[PDB]
Homo-oligomer: 333 residues x 3
């Protein structure tokens, strides 16, 4: 039955970007092949040169967003090159059975594997490494991402009408727990293994030292701000594989929001701030109505402005003074 | 267009009370004018006399609840008197553009401004100070409030039938991070600026020293308890501009709840406890059925009873044995 | 009126199991009678032998799951044997009035009391001891459980069509705050009251030392894992009386989820993870499609794998390769 299905090989794009795809499926079910190479590497996460041993899928934190349609088959080639030092695997929250695939994809350095599963449920899902015994260590090292399973007929609003986005961005929020010495200075290590014992102690406090988007403080600001123009409908996928988050677009709203990311449910309207539970991926749809700079933040202001969970959106267009304006006071009637 | 619109000035009331308004709009769009004066002042937040330098909108924590109807224009005159020492602004989650107004409202002591914005979406929203560089500090110091944008035809239940409340209260929950010395004794400072450096160090621990309703421990208890009578429909707007909370009425429920506070969505029924994400405002509707004392709390009981997030409701009326009765009063076995 | 209603005495069963009951009420409203004895006891909560003074309802943590139908009357006989040292009571989130019944059931050692209330709202609610002054201490010591008020016509899906479960399980998550000494060694006490002072201090940190399912780390693993078979519809009731949790079944999904547990509300579909607020009970409905081991965890992987909030499911049946299969098993590149 599956041999009569077309097979397509897709090349993944580094976040916050997403590979090309059709919102409304033009073909019947397919076997979408993806390839991801695991890379363990040192990553500088802040302005102060704090460095950590990131464990990544395709070299980025978060891993790339994969997009397929309901009932397509996802066939993933997971490679763990010999340059790495730890055993890894992959668990998709979209898959059914075998711990999300984690039980079937344990690969040591120098090993690879190919897993296939049917995307039977529409929605955006989290995928993350989960090695027996060191689950929270791999996840909080950035080894997580998301996969979007679009309904075959695209997104629909509260009333069943079509919702079409012109842009789509993937924002991966990551909570880090970097160990410090007695004074509070961040430690550096030679290999991931060396940091392990300290890492565990740091995680157990349940208090992140950093909370970033796209792997670093300010990763999504300045020359890297997300862009759009007045009139465009933007879909923002947001995942957090381990800790609760509450996204908010300062100066805008979430017109249609699937806080828990499951498309068979009607979206929530006009959200100012929405909660995305840890271990979940969510999606917000919004049409920009004013130009200018917008801050996309985790609305626990301390986490956004002190720990790092804040990004920018730079929107071009004409100002609408009917929506907002600085009043001039020369009158009484 | 605006020039030909009726204007109505409204005098704000200090929480938990709310200024006079109509649930169902008896007129067309209007320009509702409000005036708020910024006041930086010392505030005692607990029984032990702990004192902090509060930054308030109109002299209270939280600021007053502003109430308008969908499509009205809010016109706010913000005044920062010369007695204050810091620059402040305001960001409305209900507004579209210019960082919710923050980018258009920066005022130093001795300055004032008048912002106008269209209330395009119905629901309860948070509004807070957000000066570039010291956002968390201004919010955690109590500079936040909420605005309700009622649908022009009032509230509706799950089935589209009208919901009318007889009383409405506004509870703003506030998380405080008071700095401590080596022994654990709370610090005191002469001015807000003196406290800054320590304030940031305290915030970064992500652990509040106090979590209070209406500005202080027991602000809504004893002679300050919210009141009602068996049979009355009450609407409780609750806001938290920086941290998750989970309101609960011990002895009652949330008959119709808008946890994320956006009125175009149907409420959730018969909630025992609901989550209001930080940076959001929610609303619960309840009709009292039994007289007596009720405790309105944040259901992380440690936070409610140890940290201060607890309030009272003293309700009058006749007891109803059908709903509850002590068949056998406590007695020795 | 009540004097006429048929009465039914229920025999409680220890969690994670549930006592006999009908999903669909076969008779009209009745007075369902229950009896629970309070027991303070020492409990080993982890592999390392950490001991604590648990305060329980019926000798278990959590207390047993009580099931009744909408509009039945619940009559609970609560006994506090003279072997206990503290005063206790019970508050049902499902009841209306007297602080959920807490104000009418205060019993000292050597006392008992009988309370009757009407189950007017359908859903799974939390019940917990709540003595004036030591509320969080009693709750965080395991003195809590849940009660399910099913609709007289059983459960329904998003479209109103009947949902019938084959198995039902009750998972009570408990957050513990065990006091430690300088080195980090957990403390032991002779009696509950001796522990009180240290307890309060530990609680105020807001950081648990243990987060477990059913009373202990691994209580629902190995020979105690929950069981099911491919094709079976399972309903999992989950509660947390004081802190937020985010349930996730690794390798599965929540087909129908009532995150805040109130049945008059349609369920959310295809949830990967859902947030249940502290002081709330929720319910997830799933049908197993793959055999094998599934982990039921709190998706804050630190709280799950390091703190103890992880259970198992052992499912029997035939593997379905369409849903998922290993195309290439791990091997050297
Ligand atoms: Cu890994
Ligand atoms: Cu997971
Ligand atoms: Cu300010
Ligand atoms: Cu804000
Ligand atoms: Cu007790
Ligand atoms: Cu309670």
């Amino acid at each position: 039955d599956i041999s009569t299905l077309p097979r397509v090989k897709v090349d993944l794009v580094k976040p916050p970007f997403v590979h090309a795809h059709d919102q409304v499926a033009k073909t019947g079910p397919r076997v979408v092949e993806f390839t991801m190479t695991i890379e363990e590497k040192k990553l500088v996460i802040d302005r102060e040169g704090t460095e950590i041993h990131a464990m990544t899928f395709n070299g980025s934190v978060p891993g790339p967003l994969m997009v397929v349609h309901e009932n397509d088959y996802v066939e993933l080639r997971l490679i763990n090159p010999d340059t790495n030092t730890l055993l890894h695997n992959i668990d998709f929250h979209a898959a059914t059975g075998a711990l999300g695939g984690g039980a079937l994809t344990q690969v040591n350095p120098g090993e690879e594997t190919t897993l296939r599963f049917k995307a039977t449920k529409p929605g955006v899902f989290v995928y993350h490494c989960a090695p027996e015994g060191m689950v929270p260590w791999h996840v909080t090292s950035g080894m997580n991402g998301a996969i979007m399973v679009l309904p075959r007929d695209g997104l629909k609003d509260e009333k069943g009408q079509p919702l079409t986005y012109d842009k789509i961005y993937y924002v991966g929020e990551q909570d880090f727990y970097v160990p410090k010495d007695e004074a509070g200075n961040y430690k550096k290590y030679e290999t991931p293994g060396e940091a392990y014992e300290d890492a565990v102690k740091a995680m157990r406090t349940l208090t992140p030292t950093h909370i970033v988007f796209n792997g670093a403080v300010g990763a999504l600001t300045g020359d890297h701000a997300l862009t759009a123009a007045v009139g465009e409908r933007v879909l923002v996928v947001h995942s957090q594989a381990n800790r609760d988050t509450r996204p908010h677009l300062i100066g805008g709203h979430g017109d249609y929001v699937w806080a828990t990311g499951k498309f068979r449910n009607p979206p929530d309207l006009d959200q100012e701030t929405w909660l995305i539970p840890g271990g979940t991926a969510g999606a917000a749809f919004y049409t920009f109505r004013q130009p200018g700079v917008y801050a996309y933040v985790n609305h626990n202001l301390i986490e956004a402005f002190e720990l790092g969970a804040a990004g920018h959106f730079k929107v071009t267009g004409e100002w609408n003074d009917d929506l907002m304006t600085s009043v001039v006071k020369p009158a009484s009637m």
